[PDB]
Design a protein around this ligand. Structure first.
Ligand code: FES
Ligand code: FES
Ligand code: FES
Ligand SMILES: [Mg+2]
Ligand SMILES: [Mg+2]
Ligand SMILES: [Mg+2]
Lengths: 576, 576, 576
């Protein structure tokens, strides 16, 4: 470890008696700080994604105060810094488009200001990855505090998740099976405490990825946003980041290729969102680890999903927490040759040393190896002429008889074409057809929306059929079922083969052999591709234009090309 | 109703251009208020019992902000006013001693300052009664906001209440049946969100009493302190109190003898704390309603306890809430000739009009009339030479074979004598003995502590016996079982017959006939009483002295004598 | 000093593993505190008089957060506790009546809860004395944080104080010499930042008394409530109180008879409010120091008033601060044999060691000894048959030719009689008359209002006469001029000789000889006194009744009799 005492980067702002420093120090003193706070003790930036418009993060200012208390206790100097908050439930066209913008803004807010370490206060879907991406591109000691999930929803005395019962309550408000005064009580019971989606959606998955990567204190992922112990862990986190600054325990020493592999296997074990694939690839591209879609494939194999939570299962995050949460799961991976046991965490201990003594307190929700939901619930990476740079599928959430399936393509040229055609009873489609949607990726939608879980055509569900093969260049909510191929790359909008799929074309899906094949000749594919031109709207100005010019494919994390890698934390030139 | 517009009492401070008013108005303007806020619109005092030392009320400042928003929306002028917070879990000798002091301080803070209406932000045990007592002695329009109970505690995957498992975890930390690192996780799971005790203890009972008296919006009692809908109800409350000021909807028009009777029957139906007896008698003595121990007896009869919650039952407040909470219970009392249906509430509607359409969503926790826990779970008032001014007992929590019981007295001269003798194996006591404790009432303890649920002597539980008859002048937690006689009045310390009970004396308890008899001659009782002198310590100064001089007996609510009644809201003389 | 480590009184609540302690500790943990905060480190109660209805204290919650940060830094456990806030600008009949009630409530909030030390967050007039009174009756280590004065008011480009220009702007709104839109800008400029009255009124005087008694860090009195350095001093105060708990630096070791004498001389040097006499006598009666009106007389002599501030002078608190504030003044008293130099302060250093090196930066506001306003600007204590227990007068604010004056009495039987008669042109009064007002003391007004600075009769000011001798049993604002005799004791309402003064009686005022004489025979005084009966209204219930029964005279500080003295900090009996 590094020498303590030493001159930290904040002392470039706050150390000495040159005119430069009495400007910086004397200005900050107008908020009323004792002079010894500028003596070179660690200055801790608390990066807070709280916003009134990101209700998933509604309690994060209370957590900031707990962090602050911990920094004070440990003799640091805490400064809260709000950062761009990309909420999935408010941002249009899709929060995924603004993740890279939050990451840019976080990076520059870190490097450009006198902070020595970082607490990443996160919660809603895209906050966790964008803060880790921006923090990783600076490589100052950083630690994640997770907001935590909402409590269980109870409407009429039954367990309702968040986003699950969106179908029944909209179907019933129009089909007259409930009042409007009945419907307002129903909505008020789905999201009834501060916090994130309480299924194994993107928020729960990314909190789990943060803890499994070792970037948060052990136990961080599953505490309800509203439990006392979430405040406790916030204050302990504030104590810890001061020591981490002294020791210079940097993210590049935590997010090693072995830690990413631990996260991949944890994603399998928890049945986590397919969004974690895109985000971990993006975070690794900031740290500078070589991580690929193929790493997701090889490390995901033969890891049973063990947590019995919707969508894949029965319970919600509350129960996952009361059973011991993510540590119990990490133990089991360690008891099976799947965990890299000696991976360093932010506590200074190894992941195995943190988890090895925890007890599973409800085997109904953290299942024994025998009663697991799937024996290989990792994500699979399909390749072929239709996805030359790769596509992903969650086999746990699929239908056995459709894992190997060939069928004829019904094509939707974009999201509007899909909504026009799907419910139309004139559409030529049966259950062996393969639904194919284009122009839904990063550049195409724009922003790669969660439209990949296309709803089946009404004339197909009338037969009592619940699943069909669907392919697109889009994403999918962590909450989903069905045999869905996602993140098809290159996306249609950049001229990938998926752009030139026509109705009637034969498509073969072969998951056991990781194959996804468009059954046309190489000549016909070549001539269809040479004829291609970008049919979607091209922005001419604004951030939309920037994203259109610079976003990459979901196969490498869908980052902006000029933002890949780590640019360090060197202090910039002085402003006077 | 009253005339609106009109000159409200705040305009004595803030209306006109006399020097008196530009002092008052001009000073308050240093916090930055537009001038039209002083135009005579309702000035709403938000009386907040939040404190860092009353963790039951930990989230009340967040609720104050929701109330404030509602007052703003409705065109009032909101001003937060902290008031004395008597927390049962911090205050020694007992929070009951400071309830009257909080009520005094609340009363004077209302009458002495320019507020036209009151929001009573309450939660922990004694806050609800002391704020209602002080507000009732002013009779300005007032409305109660309840903090709400803590979530269910889960330690190892089983439901633990608050205060229930205090026995097992202390027994096991010393008997070595769990680590110290195991014990710290256990404690951190008993009280794991902001709020009050989540059984049918004094806090849940007094929240229910407030709603049943109609002094809070319907649905107020059972929302977890931490549920979104508790904030919603806070904001609606802030809107409503502005209209109530305009209409002059005063507490004296809500807390009618019929409303108190509705509360008494609700206490029976919910199996509520015996503390509600003392508090409702105290609140009624401020409003000026004639309510007596006998009213508790007659109105409590033949009301089954229907809510299946500890101590009397199986579940906790969370489940009571998800089933529909107190409105469901008030409906059932209305569907049975037990409710005064036309009693006015603070909403402007009648109690029956508020509840009549609500649905019971879990009959396991709000039981049908057939499966009720007791068919007459009201409280009973015992009288006799031993309690000439009355004593109370909760028959639901008693043992059938001990409802009628005569036995010989084992006397404990005070609380110290009890702890010295109870575990001593030399003590002459069997299970037919009647345990009798003195000097535990208002003047005696001092403050009437919750020591009435005396623990049995170890040599008696060795036989597998769980209950004995106990008598004292003390109180009991809302959480309790056993055949216990409470609030024996006059207390021992003021020379009531309980003072002169000696070991070996025959005592008869006869609940069906409301009898509690000390079997000695009237001559022997007279000569024992003439010999009496006050053996406990007499304070010479401080608040303890004031309480010693002026507190009355638990039979009339244990208020201070010079604080009984309503002194109105007349503006006092001007300070210059 | 005392042993550190040791078991502090909070460990009676939070130390061990008995059931008693897991109740207390486990409950407080619902706000989310790490377990080691209960390890016996100092628990610091931050007693906060903030209220939306005490605008003088409007920024005190921000200061509480600065204190909290300091307690955290020093390894204590900070808990904010709101206390009763007696604001002079809102409370009717007068905040003086509620000072003893705030002191009672503060005392019991300290002794009854698990705090080891106290930060007294104060500001508006009566907050400082009531918190010191309550804290002194417990004698736990305590330290004062002062809110600070408002900035200078500027209306039209001239310096206006707070309360000074109340005459001109009310005279002009009715005499048409300004618009109503002009008048609203004028009021908005008198009180234009958060803080207390910015003259040498009661708030500035009591802040100065706290610093001179050594109960606040040096420099505490004069920082504008709104200056950055007031937040700095709050945080330093939070650091310091943790050490003070460890060292057991108690108020009884700071408020020695020598410290009170230092305050008396400081009051003279600053030309402080006559209210400080009543409050210091009250505080000393809690500590148990023998301090008397005579101590005020002897120690006040020959101390020139040096601070050039209204009412006695030209500038306001802002300028007093920029010149060095109270330390500069304490130095000068030390450079003149007037200071007890070795008096201990809360910093651990002596008062002289704190101040001895400070520099006077504006001798226009802290005057040299030559240019002083008065050479003996202490307060004088008059005695005689008319004030047998004493009366006070500020000679600086008097008229030289009226210091020795005999005249005939014009009597006002109470405050209502005065307002009825004073402006009536039929009243038999010239400038040699001595105006005498009764029934304005503690029991009489009730509450001893600031009505002693009676306005002269219009027919007297028409001659260009600005001063007349006035006598009453009332108080006076810190802001005042004129030859006024105050705090006449015993007050009229308790049968003091002032009760039986009749029109035409000769009264002699002789300040140089400390004499105030009612020129009637001892026989006529005796028979007038035997005929006396209490003509004012007697309260029958409520706090008014309590005050009527128990308040004493202004000659001993006007405390409640049963609240005099120190009752210690012994932990009370356990509540279960
Ligand atoms: S919307 Fe924020 S967690 Fe799903
Ligand atoms: S201690 Fe506050 S609710 Fe029981
Ligand atoms: S009114 Fe609060 S300082 Fe004068
Ligand atoms: Mg999402
Ligand atoms: Mg209780
Ligand atoms: Mg004053």
């Amino acid at each position: 470890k590094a020498e303590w005492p030493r001159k930290l980067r904040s002392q470039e702002w706050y150390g000495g008696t040159s005119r430069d420093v009495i400007y910086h120090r004397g200005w900050l003193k107008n908020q009323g700080y004792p002079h010894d706070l500028f003596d070179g003790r660690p200055v801790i930036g608390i990066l807070n994604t709280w916003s009134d418009m990101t209700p998933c993060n509604g309690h994060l200012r209370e957590l900031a105060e707990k962090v602050k208390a911990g920094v004070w206790e440990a003799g640091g100097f805490p400064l809260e810094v709000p950062v761009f908050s990309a909420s999935e439930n408010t941002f249009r066209p899709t929060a995924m488009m603004y993740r890279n913008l939050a990451a840019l803004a976080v990076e520059e807010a870190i490097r450009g200001q006198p902070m020595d370490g970082c607490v990443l206060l996160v919660g809603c879907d895209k906050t966790t990855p964008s803060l880790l991406m921006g923090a990783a591109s600076c490589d100052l000691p950083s630690i994640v505090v997770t907001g935590g999930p909402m409590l269980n929803g109870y409407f009429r005395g039954e367990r309702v998740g968040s986003g699950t019962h969106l179908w029944k309550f909209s179907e019933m408000v129009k089909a007259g099976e409930m009042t409007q005064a009945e419907f307002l009580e129903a909505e008020a019971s789905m999201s009834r405490s501060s916090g994130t989606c309480n299924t194994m959606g993107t928020a729960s998955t990314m909190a789990s990825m943060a803890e499994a990567l070792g970037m948060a204190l052990s136990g961080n992922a599953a505490i309800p946003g509203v439990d006392s112990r979430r405040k406790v862990m916030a204050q302990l986190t504030g104590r810890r980041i001061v020591q981490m600054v002294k020791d210079d325990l940097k993210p590049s020493e935590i997010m090693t290729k072995q830690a990413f592999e631990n996260a991949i296997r944890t994603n399998a074990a928890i049945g986590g969102s397919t969004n974690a694939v895109i985000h971990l690839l993006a975070i690794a591209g900031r740290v500078g680890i070589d991580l690929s879609l193929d790493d997701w494939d090889r490390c995901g194999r033969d890891v049973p999903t063990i947590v019995n939570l919707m969508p894949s299962g029965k319970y919600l995050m509350e129960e996952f927490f009361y059973a011991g949460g993510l540590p119990v799961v990490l133990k089991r991976l360690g008891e099976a040759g799947l965990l890299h046991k000696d991976a360093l965490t932010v506590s200074g201990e190894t992941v195995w040393d943190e988890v090895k003594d925890v007890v599973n307190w409800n085997e109904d929700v953290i299942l024994p190896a025998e009663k697991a939901l799937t024996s290989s619930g990792g994500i699979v990476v399909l390749r072929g002429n239709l996805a030359p740079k790769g596509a992903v599928l969650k086999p746990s959430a699929a239908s056995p008889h459709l894992l190997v399936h060939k069928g004829r393509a019904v094509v939707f040229e974009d999201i509007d074409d899909y909504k026009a055609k799907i419910n139309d009873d004139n559409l030529d489609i049966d259950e062996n057809c393969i639904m194919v949607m284009k122009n839904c990726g990063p550049k195409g939608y724009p922003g790669m929306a969660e439209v990949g879980n296309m709803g089946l055509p009404p004339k197909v569900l009338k037969k009592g059929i619940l699943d069909m093969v669907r392919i697109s260049d889009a994403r999918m909510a962590g909450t989903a079922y069905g045999t869905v191929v996602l993140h098809t790359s290159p996306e249609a909008a950049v001229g990938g083969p998926l752009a030139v799929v026509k109705n009637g074309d034969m498509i073969e899906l072969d998951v056991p052999n990781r194959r996804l094949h468009l059954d046309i000749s190489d000549e016909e594919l070549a001539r269809r591709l040479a004829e291609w031109q970008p049919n979607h709207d091209l922005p001419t100005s604004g951030y939309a234009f920037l994203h259109q010019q610079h976003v990459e494919g979901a196969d490498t994390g869908a980052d902006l090309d000029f933002l890949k890698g780590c640019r360090g934390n060197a202090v910039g030139k002085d402003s006077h």
